[PDB]
Structure 1
Amino acid sequence: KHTVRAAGAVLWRDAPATVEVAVIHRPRYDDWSLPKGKLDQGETEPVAAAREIHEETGHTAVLGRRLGRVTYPIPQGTKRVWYWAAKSTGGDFSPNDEVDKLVWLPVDAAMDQLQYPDDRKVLRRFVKRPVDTKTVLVVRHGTAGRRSRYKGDDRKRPLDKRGRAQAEALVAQLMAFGATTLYAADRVRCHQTIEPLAQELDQLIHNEPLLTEEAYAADHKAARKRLLEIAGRPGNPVICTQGKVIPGLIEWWCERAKVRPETTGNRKGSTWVLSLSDGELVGADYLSPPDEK
């Protein structure tokens, strides 16, 4: 009942029935499996997936759609693994004592190579939908204290200490999915959330008056329109906004596209990873704040 948290991936490259996937061998278990490992202190599942892919296969990669969760018993209690689709961005495997072989296989043959039922289940998920996706990241701003007694939402109220720390932690989280462009509702706490990422990308953050809670409540259709407008642009946008805005936009998009989120929440510092194939939503993955389970 203690949970050892881990992440990994179906790492792929071009040759759905075209694509090749990576399967690894480990001497210590003499198993064939998917690359993965334990979260380090301070790490989120996406950040650990990318790191473990790199350490185990030599490859950098961009994460896309989440492919569900697997659990199994270990002496410390229960092993929990979240898996992502990850597109290789290059690298070269070198055999070692931890992982001594890596084979790239079409899905077909990878299904037969993978010895664990739960890995085959993940690979079944992977082929269920397109994997060459682009990504919209919708982020609820970090912790910023408590609303004041006044009407409206306190335009200038800043992130608190914990929130500033969530902002910093979100850089590696959002980079894992290849974020390229930045957008924030017209509130200071929304900008401050994505400022560390802005510095890292050396990028400017677009301001979004249409996506504040006041504007969403006065004209929800214009917010929706704007979201699609941004999603349509080239690149992988981060859009940081507020708690009364996100659930409505995410539900609206999921319903119209018949996409079922596997997890749901709306915490401050959380991220929805919205995977698109040819402008259609194919996944909506809720990621917890970086400082929460």
Structure 2
Amino acid sequence: HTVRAAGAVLWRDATVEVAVIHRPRYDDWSLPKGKLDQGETEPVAAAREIHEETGHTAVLGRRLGRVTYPIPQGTKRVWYWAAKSTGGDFSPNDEVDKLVWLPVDAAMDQLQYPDDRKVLRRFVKRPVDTKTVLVVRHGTAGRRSRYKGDDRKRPLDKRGRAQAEALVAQLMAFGATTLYAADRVRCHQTIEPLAQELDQLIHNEPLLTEEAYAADHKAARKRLLEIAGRPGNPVICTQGKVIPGLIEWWCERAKVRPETTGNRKGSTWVLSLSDGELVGADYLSPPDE
């Protein structure tokens, strides 16, 4: 088996301080992480584990890489995020008995595992006070038909409806506040469960269908940057042919390396921006993968 886990560098203002935890099971100093519970995706598991271990709520930002090691059960795979504390404070729990807030240099010395230190080096390499654009490929929606129009009305299938419900907690982990969808039923439907959770309208985006993208790709780019520039953390749901065109373009101009790549239905690209520049592009699997 591969056990799936998630962790973070939890940080707050003043340079910046990060949280290092102490665990009595091993008498060690490390970054918060834990295992995914049933039906959870990594971002959710990170936020939960940060709250359980540290007492802090937080909003995830840039992904900071992956750590993999053997365990009795097989292999543990831990994905890490940068996480801005949004409040709270620590008190001892069974897993974690002490927590210290340390500037990065002092954290680096406090952390006993080389793999943690590597994560913290990734954290400091780029800005961490970022805003976030969440580009989502619509969920599964059955078969393309022979009628012209790119099936404007074709709905999510059962699996896709489930993928949409699963996205809510995942997108909320990144502080999603505003909703945008290409002018296709299946794109809207994929973020309607989030819309219900936030109680918010979805802005329709005819410039971001595959049709419009091909006819005027420059209009789509311009619109994406417009959406990105507004306050808040926008969710933009679009189609398969649009996404790589836009992401690959934006990564190449910003000199951003995506550590993973894909484009499955119900996947999310977490785009981190600092000062309006892209500093990260993180591909997340569909929640039922």
TM-score calculated relative to the size of structure 1: 0.98
Residue 152 (structure 1) shift: 3.4
> For structure 1, which runs of at least 5 residues remain unmatched after alignment?
none
Alignment of 1:119-134 (within 5 A): 119-134=116-131
Question: Counterparts of 2:94 and 2:52 in 1: how far apart (Å)?
Answer: 12
Instruction: Give the structure 2 partner of residue 34 of structure 1.
Output: 31
Secondary structure of the corresponding residue to residue 199 of structure 1: helix
Residue 3 (structure 1) shift: 1.0
Question: Counterparts of 2:28 and 2:4 in 1: how far apart (Å)?
Answer: 20
Question: Counterparts of 1:205 and 1:89 in 2: how far apart (Å)?
Answer: 26
Residue 151 (structure 1) shift: 3.0
Secondary structure of the corresponding residue to residue 7 of structure 1: strand
Instruction: Give the structure 2 partner of residue 200 of structure 1.
Output: 197
Question: Counterparts of 1:96 and 1:231 in 2: how far apart (Å)?
Answer: 40
Deviations 1:50-98 (A, max 9, x none): 0000011000000000000001111111111000000000011111221
1:190 aligns with 2:187: yes
Question: Counterparts of 1:39 and 1:201 in 2: how far apart (Å)?
Answer: 24
The runs of at least 4 consecutive aligned structure 1 residues that moved more than 3 Å come to: none
Q: Is the 8 A contact 2:10 2:82 kept in 1?
A: yes
Residue 150 (structure 1) shift: 2.3
Question: Counterparts of 1:113 and 1:36 in 2: how far apart (Å)?
Answer: 16
Question: Counterparts of 1:124 and 1:163 in 2: how far apart (Å)?
Answer: 38
Deviations 1:33-56 (A, max 9, x none): 010101111110001000000011
1:8 aligns with 2:21: no
Q: Is the 8 A contact 2:3 2:35 kept in 1?
A: yes
TM-score calculated relative to the size of structure 2: 0.99
Deviations 1:183-211 (A, max 9, x none): 00000000000000011111100000000
> For structure 2, which runs of at least 5 residues remain unmatched after alignment?
none
Residue 154 (structure 1) shift: 0.3
Q: Is the 8 A contact 2:53 2:93 kept in 1?
A: no
Secondary structure of the corresponding residue to residue 93 of structure 2: coil
Secondary structure of the corresponding residue to residue 134 of structure 2: strand
Residue 21 (structure 1) shift: 0.2
Instruction: Give the structure 1 partner of residue 143 of structure 2.
Output: 146
Secondary structure of the corresponding residue to residue 91 of structure 2: coil
Deviations 1:87-140 (A, max 9, x none): 000011111221000000000100000000000000000000000000000000
Deviations 1:138-165 (A, max 9, x none): 0000000010122331000000001000
Question: Counterparts of 1:167 and 1:97 in 2: how far apart (Å)?
Answer: 35
Secondary structure of the corresponding residue to residue 6 of structure 1: strand
Question: Counterparts of 2:77 and 2:113 in 1: how far apart (Å)?
Answer: 14
Deviations 1:262-288 (A, max 9, x none): 000000000000000000000000000
Secondary structure of the corresponding residue to residue 9 of structure 2: strand
Quick check: 89-98 or 276-285, which moved more? Answer: 89-98
Quick check: 94-103 or 252-261, which moved more? Answer: 94-103
Secondary structure of the corresponding residue to residue 249 of structure 1: helix
Question: Counterparts of 1:242 and 1:189 in 2: how far apart (Å)?
Answer: 9
Instruction: Select which of 85, 97, 100 maps to 1:88.
Output: 85
Secondary structure of the corresponding residue to residue 261 of structure 1: coil
Q: Is the 8 A contact 2:7 2:78 kept in 1?
A: yes
Q: Is the 8 A contact 2:32 2:53 kept in 1?
A: yes
Secondary structure of the corresponding residue to residue 191 of structure 2: helix
Question: Counterparts of 1:163 and 1:116 in 2: how far apart (Å)?
Answer: 40
Question: Counterparts of 1:152 and 1:104 in 2: how far apart (Å)?
Answer: 56
Indicate the RMSD between aligned Cα atoms, in angstroms. Answer: 0.8
Instruction: Give the structure 2 partner of residue 257 of structure 1.
Output: 254
Determine what percentage of the aligned residue pairs are the same residue: 100
